[PDB]
RNA sequence: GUAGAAACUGCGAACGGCUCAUUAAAACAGUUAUAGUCUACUUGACAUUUAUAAGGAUAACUACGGAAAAGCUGUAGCUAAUACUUGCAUUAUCCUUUUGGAUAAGUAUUUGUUAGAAGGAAUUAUAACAAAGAAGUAACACGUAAAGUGUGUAUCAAUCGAGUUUCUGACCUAUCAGCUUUUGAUGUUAGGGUAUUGGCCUAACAUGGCUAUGACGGGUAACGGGGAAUUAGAGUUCGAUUCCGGAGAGGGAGCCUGAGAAAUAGCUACCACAUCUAAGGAAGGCAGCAGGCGCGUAAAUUACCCAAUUCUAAAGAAGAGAGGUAGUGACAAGAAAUA
């Protein structure tokens, strides 16, 4: 038969997930759910290979089986299950709290968060859909229905939903003035406060975002995630602060110790 | 028998009520010093009342003597070493014994005794 | 060769062995189902009466009601077909199988009494085993004791001390689970309708 | 209470592993579409035309058997289940205007008549009227804060995927130049079929479609790509083989279950081989892991283990020749004694 393939290969596997080539033959092929597999890490190697709690997979079921951690403050025992693209991960028994973030170079990390930050999740919305009874919802990135959303919400906004009650709380918009976080690109990890929207009728509509050193990069407006107003962004962003330094000067940096 | 016990990256592990890092065993100009004198020396240096809550593994004595790395992990209380290690590594440990190692010829019998071909 | 008489009533059976073809001629050229004096096999047996029921053919293959040889025949065997005990889920397998038509190659052969006869048979109709483990249903046990709704049936237990449980009961746990997925929808009723109206002053 | 042989029920066995015979615009690759579709597990939303809890019938089991033999099974008697099957409030709208009366009641899907948040474009979402109408909305199980979980369920969405699909890209050969078209070839119309579009199939109709920019053929000791060797630069040659895609399970064909298979350690038949047989009849598929024969210039152990990687499960605890560990190993590769 060819039925839907169930193992993952770890030269297969995504890069960021970082697994070395020589430790294993598989992957943790992370099951259905909230996110993509390509663009979502596995409780596995959020538990294993970044916060180094586990040294093996059944480490992590054991972890996973008191019911410790929570992803969106719900308990989540499943040790291939996405993460997503920015979400709060609460370790209970060490009291901590973590959103995972991309760094600059496009790799899924866990910023350490506070307890009064570990209540808003950035949704970005993806379609709007009216069903019976005029009724409308909208289909995040996160993969939630929010039914009843504001009339104002548009398809490529952004909802701060409060994670206990799941209803939003803000929107934020795409203007030229808003500041996003690129997704999936050469440019992801950067926040850059969108220069411009160039739309083009029948195929891919490209955004242009300036840096804050006033670097200039474009993208797919499917790899964008608006992250607040011109003000400030609505999350504490990773260390990096969502700049992407060159190459040659970061060596710099580097050697500067 | 002295030597130094370098203890790096070590972290707290509520998770598993174990404390993780990894060990350098600065013994200079004498031979690889047994695990029993390590886990004395370990409780000393952590304040520890006993010497069956640790686990060291991994032991490898580089090239031309004189220094020892490893991992050990500190365990909160025995109940707990038993709720998170394997059965090999607690018979390693010597707290409790070995299996019945009669191994893979179970999975000849398993189909060998073929449900309703026998009886019992 | 080796009769099988059962008995339904008494729940027990008597196997007869006998090498005379002319006892069991009556028997031949009869399908699965019928009805035949069983006189010629016994004088004890004189007055009974048995229904052809099953039977093996010299090789042992069974013989099958709807087909209507005196042979044996190959066919397809089904899912819900008597004489097939399926491998996998939807395995489906040809065999050979005795036709229902009896004749002189039955290497054994089973009936059952239908209506008495005029003798006694030891272990025939001189004792009997009831149902060797009584009926798990409260419902079944409420028809068993004619009791109704009056009171509980866990101290009507049939023990071999040791109790069988009741299936379908009315336990506490059973009327609490039924209130709280009432109250389930009694609250999730409310608290759409107060999501449902919020909307609306939002709405302007 | 603690467990629990067996068995019924549930899920998985459609993944993995192996091989490269087939295959030359096919497969594959990059690039699209699905506004032409299906999608289990998982995640988020969330539902409509005796009730202090309904029905029979079966496994396991018991007794009697048949056959040389098989993962064969006959009869009789019992019993459950989240197996199989029946079946028990309510909400919304109009108004004098917290509050009172009045009005109305089918989820998908199909047909007819209409109005019309988004997309690039709608016969879209949705809404109204008129007809039909599936399936369901718990007659099920265990227990967390100093109410919870499991299992099951209608629809939508997400996800894990799949099937089709656009554009472009391949070796040699003209001592292959005209092919296709009754036998569907090219297209129109209508329908059937499908999960959906489609000559996919059928009926009628028209005579189209491809080709020296190489059609149609033939050959390939041809699975395609990522890649390999040799490269100053161009090139030439190789790619069975770690990953991806395809195809196959001796050769064909057919089919059940299922979300998913034209499955092959599933079934049905023929062809070729081939095993047992008491001669009546049974059972088979190493291009899985070892291992044997044969073939050949040409290739290892009938080993140990689930400790790691990861998958299936009723999901810590069991399994896994997946996989790992060692054995054989001057295939290659690196360091480096014989002072």
Not at chain 3, 82 to 111: F, H, T
């Amino acid at each position: 038969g060819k039925g839907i393939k169930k193992h993952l290969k770890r030269v297969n596997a995504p890069s960021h997930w970082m697994l070395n080539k020589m430790g294993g033959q598989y992957a943790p092929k992370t099951s259905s759910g909230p996110h993509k597999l390509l663009e979502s890490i596995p409780l596995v190697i959020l538990l294993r290979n970044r916060l180094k709690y586990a040294l093996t997979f059944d480490e992590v079921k054991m972890i996973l089986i008191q019911k410790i951690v929570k992803v969106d403050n719900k308990v989540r025992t499943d040790c291939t299950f996405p993460v997503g693209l920015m979400d709060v991960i609460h370790i209970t028994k060490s009291n901590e709290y973590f959103r995972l973030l991309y760094d600059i170079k496009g790799r899924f990390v866990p910023h350490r968060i506070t307890n009064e930050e570990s209540k808003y999740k950035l949704c970005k919305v993806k379609k709007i859909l009216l069903r019976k009874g005029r009724l409308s919802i909208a289909v995040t990135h996160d993969g939630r229905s929010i039914p009843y959303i504001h009339p104002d919400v548009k398809v490529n906004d952004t909802v701060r939903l409060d994670l206990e009650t799941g209803k939003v709380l803000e929107h934020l918009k795409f203007q030229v003035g808003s500041l996003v976080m690129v997704t999936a690109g050469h440019s992801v990890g950067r926040v850059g406060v969108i220069s411009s929207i160039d739309k083009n009728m029948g195929t891919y509509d490209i955004i242009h975002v300036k840096d804050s050193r006033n670097k200039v990069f474009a993208t797919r407006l499917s790899n964008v995630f608006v992250i607040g107003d011109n003000t400030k962004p609505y999350i504490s962003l990773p260390r990096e602060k969502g700049i992407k330094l060159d190459i040659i000067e970061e060596r710099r940096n580097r050697l500067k110790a | 028998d002295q030597f130094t016990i370098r203890v790096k990256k070590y972290m707290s592990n509520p998770l598993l009520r174990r404390k993780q890092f990894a060990l350098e065993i600065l013994h200079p100009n004498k031979g690889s010093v047994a695990k029993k004198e390590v886990k004395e020396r370990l409780a000393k240096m952590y304040k520890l009342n006993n010497v069956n809550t640790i686990v060291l593994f991994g032991f490898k004595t580089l090239f031309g003597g004189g220094r020892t790395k490893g991992f050990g992990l500190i365990y909160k209380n025995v109940d707990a070493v038993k709720k998170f290690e394997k059965k090999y590594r607690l018979v390693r440990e010597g707290l409790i014994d070995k299996e019945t190692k009669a191994g893979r010829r179970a999975s000849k019998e398993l189909k060998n005794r073929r449900k309703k071909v026998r009886g019992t | 060769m080796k009769l099988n008489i059962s008995n339904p009533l008494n729940n027990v059976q008597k196997s007869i062995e006998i090498d005379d073809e002319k006892k069991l001629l009556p028997f031949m050229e009869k399908r699965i189902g019928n009805a035949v004096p069983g006189d010629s096999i016994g004088e004890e047996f004189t007055g009974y009466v048995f229904r052809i029921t099953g039977g093996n053919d010299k090789q042992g293959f069974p013989m099958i009601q709807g087909v209507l040889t005196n042979n044996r025949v190959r066919l397809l065997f089904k899912k819900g077909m008597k004489c097939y005990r399926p491998r996998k889920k939807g395995e489906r397998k040809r065999k050979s199988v005795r036709g229902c038509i009896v004749g002189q190659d039955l290497s054994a052969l089973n009936l059952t009494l239908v209506k008495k006869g005029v003798n006694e048979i030891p272990g025939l109709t001189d004792k009997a085993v009831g149902k060797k483990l009584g009926p798990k249903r409260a419902s079944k046990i409420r028809k068993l004791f004619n009791l109704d709704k009056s009171d509980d049936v866990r101290k009507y237990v049939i023990g071999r001390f040791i109790k069988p449980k009741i299936q379908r009961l009315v336990t506490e746990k059973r009327l609490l689970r039924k209130r709280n997925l009432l109250q389930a929808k009694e609250k999730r009723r409310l608290e759409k309708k107060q999501q449902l109206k919020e909307y609306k002053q939002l709405l302007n």
